[PDB]
Structure 1
Amino acid sequence: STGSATTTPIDSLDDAYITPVQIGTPAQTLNLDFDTGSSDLWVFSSETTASEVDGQTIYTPSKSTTAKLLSGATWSISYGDGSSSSGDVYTDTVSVGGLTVTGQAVESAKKVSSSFTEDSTIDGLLGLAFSTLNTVSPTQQKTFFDNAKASLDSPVFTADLGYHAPGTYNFGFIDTTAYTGSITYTAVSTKQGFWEWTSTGYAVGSGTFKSTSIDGIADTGTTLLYLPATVVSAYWAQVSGAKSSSSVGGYVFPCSATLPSFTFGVGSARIVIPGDYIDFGPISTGSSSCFGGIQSSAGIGINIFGDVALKAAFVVFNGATTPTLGFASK
């Protein structure tokens, strides 16, 4: 079986992308944030504190005849952004783009963070990291991908984010129609449960490529590109006016300024993010400072290949036994 669904950004800066998902019987469609750096399927619901639901579509486990309590089961997550979600757990049929997974663990929030509450467009998250990270206790659960896998034609899913536009999530197959040239597969370390890979270097605009191993995760759940202090300085050094700021907490640039492109190496191949991808617009409305898309990783612990970077390539998450990450130009 395969499934394809349309992902659409939720705002003009493509701060995140949202995918329609059918949960329940009959079907309740929620828009979830597909998160390849998290292992939890969670959604706003019928139990969620009514002080923390503001415009989101809710999943009503009451109205699904396929829905049952996982009695005793419970979840809690912390995100890198400082996001916090928690509640009870149910088992339900979940369909994504016609790929139906029966008996999927759907994590019903009782409690959600400010961050999620101030976010009207997103109805929950669908984790597509490795199952080791799934939060649910006392009996830990598998992801939707983990559930789909053997049912799939191929144990893979592709990610094809658009820049100011829809893109696509495909499960079970590779559209040879969606990229240009060759896909370069690179080795994945599963050990921390991430889609965890090592980049072969970087170039700043038309400058000379530096060969240097940047260990990082592909995470479609992270908006920007997070890279070592060193790498980040070399980039912003090329934009007049760019400064790192105490108060704003990150690199900014005069919005009148011009972003050189950024190039990252996947093996022998190279991926250009156009400079336009790294403009995240003014820090506050009216401001002539604009916020950059490539930020230091120094304060997080890990380099994140976020949307900024992934949305410049056609990515393939090979969920094989010997998991492999594929990148191609599009």
Structure 2
Amino acid sequence: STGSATTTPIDSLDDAYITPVQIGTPAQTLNLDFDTGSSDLWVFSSETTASEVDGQTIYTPSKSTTAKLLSGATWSISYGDGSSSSGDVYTDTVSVGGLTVTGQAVESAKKVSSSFTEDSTIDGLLGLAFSTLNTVSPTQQKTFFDNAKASLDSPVFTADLGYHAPGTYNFGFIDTTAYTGSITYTAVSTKQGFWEWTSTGYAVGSGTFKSTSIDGIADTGTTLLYLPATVVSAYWAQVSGAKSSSSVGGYVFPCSATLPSFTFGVGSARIVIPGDYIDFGPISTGSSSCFGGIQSSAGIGINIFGDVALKAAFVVFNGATTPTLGFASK
């Protein structure tokens, strides 16, 4: 079997992407943030504290003839951005772009932090990192991809995010019309539960490529590209007026600038992120300064190839016994 679903930016800056997911019988459609950096499928629900719901569509398991409460199981997650959520666990029929998994763990939120409440467009998350990061306790649950994996024509899923436009998540197949050139694969370490790999270097604009190993994770649930301070400073030094701002939380630059591209290595292959993708957006509508799409990973503890980097590529998350990650230009 296969699945294909369109993912759409939640706003004019691509702060996050939402993909419609059908849960239960009859179908209840929620717009979830597909996150290759986490492993819990959680939703706003009929159990969520009313004061913490502000416009989200909720999952109501009592209206699903296929929902089954997983008694004694709870979940609680904290993300890198300081946000969090927790609740109870059901299993139900979950479909993504025509691909159906029966008995998928659907984590019903009882509590969500203010960051989730303020994003009316995100009804929950669908985790796509390794199932070893799932927070369901005591019984750890599998991701939607892990559960689907056996029934798919091939154990893979692909991310094809758009820049200020819709994109596609496909499960079980490779669309050969979605990229230019070929898909270059690279080794993945599953030791931390992430799609962790090592980039072979970088180039700033038309500069000479610098061969240097950069370990990082392919994370669709992170908005920006977070790389070591050395790389990031070499990039922003090419932009007049660029500087790190403590009040804004990272590199800003005058919105007047047209930015250089940024190339990252995948083995002997090269993925080029256009300058416009790195011009993330103005710090406010009408502001003098714009926020950088490439930021330092120094405070985080891990480099993150987030949406700014991933939207410049067709990305294959190969979930075979020994996982690998593929990148193609587009």
- The alpha carbon displacement at 1:244 in A equals 0.7
Q: Give secondary structure in 2 for the equivalent of 1:154.
A: coil
Q: Give secondary structure in 2 for the equivalent of 1:220.
A: coil
- The alpha carbon displacement at 1:322 in A equals 1.4
Q: Distance in 2 between matches of 1:26 and 1:166?
A: 27
CA deviations over 1:64-106 (Å, ceiling 9, x no partner): 0101111110000011111101000111000001110000000
- The alpha carbon displacement at 1:285 in A equals 3.2
CA deviations over 1:105-148 (Å, ceiling 9, x no partner): 00000000111100011100000000000000011100000000
- The alpha carbon displacement at 1:323 in A equals 0.6
Q: Distance in 1 between matches of 2:299 and 2:276?
A: 25
Q: Distance in 1 between matches of 2:72 and 2:141?
A: 13
- The alpha carbon displacement at 1:154 in A equals 0.1
Q: Distance in 1 between matches of 2:229 and 2:71?
A: 46
- The alpha carbon displacement at 1:263 in A equals 0.3
What TM-score, normalized to structure 1? 0.99
- The alpha carbon displacement at 1:177 in A equals 1.0
Q: Residues 94-243 of structure 1 correspond to what in structure 2 (within 5 A)? A: 94-243=94-243
Query: Which contiguous aligned blocks of 4+ residues in structure 1 show a shift greater than 3 angstroms?
Result: none
The corresponding residue for 1:79 is 79
Q: Distance in 1 between matches of 2:205 and 2:97?
A: 38
CA deviations over 1:4-30 (Å, ceiling 9, x no partner): 001111111011100000000010000
- The alpha carbon displacement at 1:257 in A equals 1.2
Q: Distance in 1 between matches of 2:113 and 2:140?
A: 22
- The alpha carbon displacement at 1:226 in A equals 0.2
Q: Distance in 2 between matches of 1:64 and 1:246?
A: 48
State the percentage of identical aligned residues. 100
Aligned positions, number: 330
Deviates more, 1:244-253 or 1:154-163: 244-253
- The alpha carbon displacement at 1:286 in A equals 2.6
Q: Distance in 1 between matches of 2:149 and 2:50?
A: 36
- The alpha carbon displacement at 1:284 in A equals 2.5
Q: Give secondary structure in 2 for the equivalent of 1:51.
A: helix
- The alpha carbon displacement at 1:245 in A equals 1.1
Q: Distance in 2 between matches of 1:94 and 1:246?
A: 42
Q: Give secondary structure in 2 for the equivalent of 1:189.
A: coil
What TM-score, normalized to structure 2? 0.99
Deviates more, 1:275-284 or 1:2-11: 275-284
Q: Root-mean-square deviation (CA), in Å? A: 0.6
Q: Give secondary structure in 2 for the equivalent of 1:93.
A: strand
- The alpha carbon displacement at 1:248 in A equals 1.3
Q: Distance in 2 between matches of 1:55 and 1:230?
A: 42
Q: Distance in 2 between matches of 1:284 and 1:168?
A: 29
Q: Distance in 1 between matches of 2:180 and 2:258?
A: 27
Q: Give secondary structure in 2 for the equivalent of 1:115.
A: helix
Q: Distance in 1 between matches of 2:156 and 2:282?
A: 38
Q: Give secondary structure in 2 for the equivalent of 1:325.
A: strand
Q: Distance in 1 between matches of 2:230 and 2:35?
A: 27
- The alpha carbon displacement at 1:219 in A equals 0.2
Q: Give secondary structure in 2 for the equivalent of 1:107.
A: strand
- The alpha carbon displacement at 1:246 in A equals 1.7
- The alpha carbon displacement at 1:247 in A equals 1.4
- The alpha carbon displacement at 1:180 in A equals 1.0
- The alpha carbon displacement at 1:300 in A equals 0.2
Q: Distance in 2 between matches of 1:80 and 1:221?
A: 11
Q: Distance in 1 between matches of 2:271 and 2:219?
A: 16
Q: Distance in 2 between matches of 1:179 and 1:258?
A: 25
Q: Distance in 2 between matches of 1:281 and 1:319?
A: 34
CA deviations over 1:242-279 (Å, ceiling 9, x no partner): 01112112000000112110000000000000000011
Q: Give secondary structure in 2 for the equivalent of 1:182.
A: coil
The corresponding residue for 1:34 is 34
Q: Give secondary structure in 2 for the equivalent of 1:30.
A: strand
Q: Distance in 2 between matches of 1:281 and 1:98?
A: 34
- The alpha carbon displacement at 1:324 in A equals 0.7
